[PDB]
Every structure is written in C-alpha cells, then in structure tokens.
C-alpha cells in the first residue's frame, strides 16, 4: 500500500518536518546495502549527495533479484520496490524496507547488476515508468538506488546535510569494520572513507 505509507510516514521513517525522517530515508537504503555484507558478499558501499538534492547508494552485494515473480507477474525487483516487506528479508519476529523509500520519493532510479546483465527501472511516487529492463552486460553484481525525496511528504528541512550522513556512516563503519564505506558530495568534492 504505497498510499498507506504516504498516509502514515512517521510510522516508518520518523519525523517528516525536522530533517530526521529525510535523512532516515538514506539510512534505510544504506542499511540494505550493509545487510548484504553478511547476506551476500558486499565489500564496498558508496553514498553520494548529488547537486539536485538526491542521494545515491551503490553496493556490490548480490543485486536485488530481477526474475519475474509469479504471483505479481512483474520482476522481483518491482515487487521489492512496491510491496511493503517484500523480498524474503522481513522477519516479523526480529527495519523498514526500500519500498518505504520509494513510496516517499518524487523519483527513484534503480540500477541492478545481476546474472550477467545491467537492469534499470525508474519510479515516480512509487509508480514504475516501464517494467524492469535490461540495459547491457556486466560481470559485476550490486544495486544502486538514487532517490529524490517527495516534497509532499518532507517539509521544512528538505535538503540533505553532509555532516548528518557522515556521522551515521562513521558509526556504521565502527560496527561493520570489514566494509569499505565512501561518502562523496558532488556539490563541492568533499569525500570521506571509512574505516
Ligand atoms: C541500494 C542498496 C540496496 O538496497 N541493496 C540491496 N541489495 C539487495 C540484495 C537488496 C534486497 C532487498 S530484499 C532482497 N532479497 C533477496 C533475496 C534473495 C536473494 C538471492 O537469492 O540472491 C537476494 C536478495 N534483497 S536491497
């Protein structure tokens, strides 16, 4: 229920007015990349602030699955992106899910490297422009999500702040010291590497 998330955003990502929910959007995507260090073989995560107030997260995990999911008749990726808790990682006895980020984004770009192919899909408020599609060949595996947050959901503090992201990435590095984490700001060229 993408509308259900937009109806109750605080219940998923926190306060939508003081900047904290805005930055929790990034941390949800980063938490999904971090989980692949154990669930897959992720060794490197790159978090970039773009000049148009979007953030991307690139990992070298397994890649969000791309095959057609039988019940929905669309790619698994699309299901993961549009259906709350979908994807085989939610344990109702054990966070939020990339579908929450998609629901609360004006636009989301998804690029997956998996099974020899590059795959791409663009969403607007959680609605795909086209089915996931193959764009080329690759030997890599991984997932890149770049999102532009919805100004219908996020108010007041709406711009991403380098220092808020660096502080949480520095904590995450301490607890995941085998993963290379890079933060880059395209606006001014600032970067930090952890550990
Ligand atoms: C942008 C950073 C990001 O979100 N990376 C992400 N990588 C992955 C891999 C993500 C994800 C979300 S549910 C999910 N399920 C599966 C289930 C099975 C397999 C497999 O059998 O191979 C891989 C992933 N995988 S989310």
Ligand 1 centre distance from Cα of residue 34 (Å): 11
**Binding site: residue ranges?**
32, 59, 80, 83, 86, 88-89, 91, 95-99
Please check whether residue 30 is in contact with residue 7, taking contact to mean a CB–CB distance below 8 angstroms: no
Structure tokens at 146: 């770049």
**Domains in the chain, CATH or no CATH each:** 1-195 (3.30.565.10)
Give percent helix, percent strand, percent coil of the chain, each to the nearest 5: 30, 30, 40
Residue labelled with tokens 């970067």: 191
* Header resolution in angstroms: 1.5
Question: What does the alpha-carbon distance between residue 112 and residue 62 come to, in Å, rounded to a whole number?
Answer: 9
Neighbours of 51 (CB within 10 A): 9
Residue labelled with tokens 């959680």: 126
| Stated length of the chain | 195
- Among residues 120, 115, 116, 106, the alpha carbon closest in space to that of 54 is found at 106
Report how this structure was experimentally obtained: X-ray
Question: What does the alpha-carbon distance between residue 146 and residue 158 come to, in Å, rounded to a whole number?
Answer: 16
Residue labelled with tokens 């953030």: 55
**Binding site for ATP: residue ranges?**
59, 88-89, 95-98
88 ligand 1 Cβ < 6 A: yes
Please check whether residue 44 is in contact with residue 180, taking contact to mean a CB–CB distance below 8 angstroms: yes
> Residue 88: CB partners within 8 Å, gap ≥ 6?
none
Residue 69 dihedral angles phi and psi, to the nearest 5°: -90, 125
> Residue 32: CB partners within 8 Å, gap ≥ 6?
57, 59, 98, 143
145 ligand 1 Cβ < 6 A: yes
Ligand 1 centre distance from Cα of residue 58 (Å): 12
Ligand 1 centre distance from Cα of residue 143 (Å): 8
143 ligand 1 Cβ < 6 A: yes
């Amino acid at each position: 229920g993408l509308d259900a998330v937009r109806k109750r955003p605080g219940m998923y990502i926190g306060d939508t007015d003081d900047g904290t929910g805005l930055h929790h959007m990034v941390f949800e995507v980063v938490d999904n990349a971090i989980d692949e260090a154990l669930a897959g073989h992720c060794k490197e995560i790159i978090v970039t602030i773009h000049a148009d107030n979007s953030v991307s997260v690139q990992d070298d995990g397994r890649g969000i699955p791309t095959g057609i999911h039988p019940e929905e008749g669309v790619s698994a990726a699309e299901v993961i992106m549009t259906v709350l808790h979908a994807g085989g990682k939610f344990d109702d006895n054990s966070g939020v899910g990339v579908s929450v980020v998609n629901a609360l984004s004006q636009k989301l770009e998804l690029v997956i490297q998996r099974e020899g192919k590059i795959h791409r899909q663009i969403y607007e408020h959680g609605v795909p422009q086209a089915p996931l599609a193959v764009t080329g060949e690759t030997e890599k595996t991984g997932t890149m999500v770049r999102f532009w947050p919805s100004l219908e959901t996020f108010t007041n503090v709406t711009e991403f702040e380098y220092e808020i992201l660096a502080k949480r990435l520095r904590e995450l590095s301490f607890l995941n010291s085998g993963v290379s984490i890079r933060l880059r700001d395209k606006r001014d060229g600032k970067e930090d590497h952890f550990h």
